[PDB]
């Protein structure tokens, strides 16, 4: 309850558009058109969850710059913020040092700046530290000569006088913020895509509350969804019951992944003392179904029962949600649990919803169901992640 998430942008335009970011992962989000003064005595701000700001600062000089950041940074921290974004240029237009060494001195000792202004959809990628606005490093482009604010220093190690990291080719989110941490308190990291910027949000999440990232909008909806995930709580659970090929593909992709899989026989699935021992023995578990129908039961008795047991474990046990494939399987669950339908939210993608049961005994739990014929191998995957990574109010 009350403000989590405090985004310091430099401009208006930047403000929006982040903010839109966490909007769309979930987040109750207010955003001023000037500072957070006017929002914070407000007590519409008891509702917010993330409040952004712009300091219009971008063409200021570097000690008025200066001035405006460390203000709003005390204001934000002042209020209970507890995670900070601080929004800048993709292209460092603007008192770039002067901000970020304001901005995480206000925040606390302990502060690490973790700057990357990566933006690979519009083509700013760092590369060994240094800004790149396609192939060319940003001081080769029209920026160099931008009439309010020239680029002049591509290198942000340079421009900053800091240390810089890239992640290695198959490196972990929790080795990489180990070496965050040991490069504080102001670091660069290198991205190329979309994934090294997860990679680099993943790290960053884990480092908590001291690590302050400093990025344009290609780290927006990145942060949003890991600071989002951190609020989930339990395993995903999946329950697959399609016998059409794509699910199986599906499914032995997610046990792939790591879910933990129960994959009973048919004689199993219908002895009660099988799902016993295998809930005893158990961020997602998955329930496959095996193709046919339990002796002696009907032709639904598959998914009947693996619905049914699903709704024993989550009651039982809690999740963080569920996902169930294809429609006999979301049926089942459903009715299981006594939902009458799902209060809807988004989607995982296209056909892949995302909502909230309604009605029943697990009323409010993140729910996603899917055909199943339907979706790429990595689908249940996503859809675990998805819920994981949605803000739920
Ligand atoms: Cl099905």
Request: net charge negative; charged share 20%.
């Amino acid at each position: 309850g009350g403000p989590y998430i405090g985004i310091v942008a430099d401009d208006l335009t930047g403000s929006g558009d982040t903010a839109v970011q966490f909007v769309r992962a979930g987040w109750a989000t207010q955003l001023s058109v000037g500072g957070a003064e006017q929002a914070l005595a407000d007590p519409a701000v008891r509702q917010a969850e993330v409040l952004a700001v712009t300091t219009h600062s971008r063409p200021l000089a570097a000690a008025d710059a200066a001035a405006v950041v460390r203000g709003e940074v005390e204001r934000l921290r002042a209020a209970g913020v507890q995670r900070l974004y601080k929004k800048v240029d993709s292209t460092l237009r603007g008192a770039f040092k002067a901000e970020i060494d304001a901005a995480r001195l206000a925040w606390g000792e302990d502060a690490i700046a973790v700057v990357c202004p990566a933006f690979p959809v519009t083509g700013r990628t760092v590369r060994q530290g240094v800004l790149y606005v396609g192939d060319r490093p940003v001081t080769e482009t029209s920026a160099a000569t931008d009439p309010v604010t020239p680029v002049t220093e591509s290198h942000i190690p340079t421009l900053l006088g800091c240390a810089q990291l890239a992640a290695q080719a198959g490196e972990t989110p929790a080795e990489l913020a180990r070496r965050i941490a040991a490069a504080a308190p102001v670091v660069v990291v290198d991205a190329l895509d979309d994934a090294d910027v997860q990679r680099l949000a993943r790290a960053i999440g884990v480092l908590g509350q001291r690590a302050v990232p400093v990025g344009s909008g290609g780290l927006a909806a990145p942060l949003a969804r890991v600071w989002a995930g951190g609020q989930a709580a339990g395993p995903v659970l999946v329950v697959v019951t399609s016998q059409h090929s794509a699910a199986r593909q599906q499914a032995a992709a997610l046990q792939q992944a790591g879910a933990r899989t129960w994959a009973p026989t048919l004689a199993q699935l219908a002895d009660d003392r099988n799902w016993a021992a295998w809930t005893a023995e158990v961020d997602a578990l998955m329930l496959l179904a095996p193709e046919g129908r339990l002796a002696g039961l009907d032709a639904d008795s598959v998914a009947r029962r693996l619905g049914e047991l699903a709704a024993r474990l989550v009651l039982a046990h809690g999740a963080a949600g569920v996902v169930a494939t294809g429609g006999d399987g979301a049926s089942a669950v459903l009715a299981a649990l006594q939902a009458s339908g799902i209060a809807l939210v988004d989607e995982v993608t296209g056909g892949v919803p995302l909502g909230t049961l309604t009605g029943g005994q697990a009323a409010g739990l993140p729910v996603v169901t899917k055909a199943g014929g339907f979706g790429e191998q990595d689908v249940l995957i996503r859809a675990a992640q998805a819920i994981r990574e949605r803000r739920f109010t």
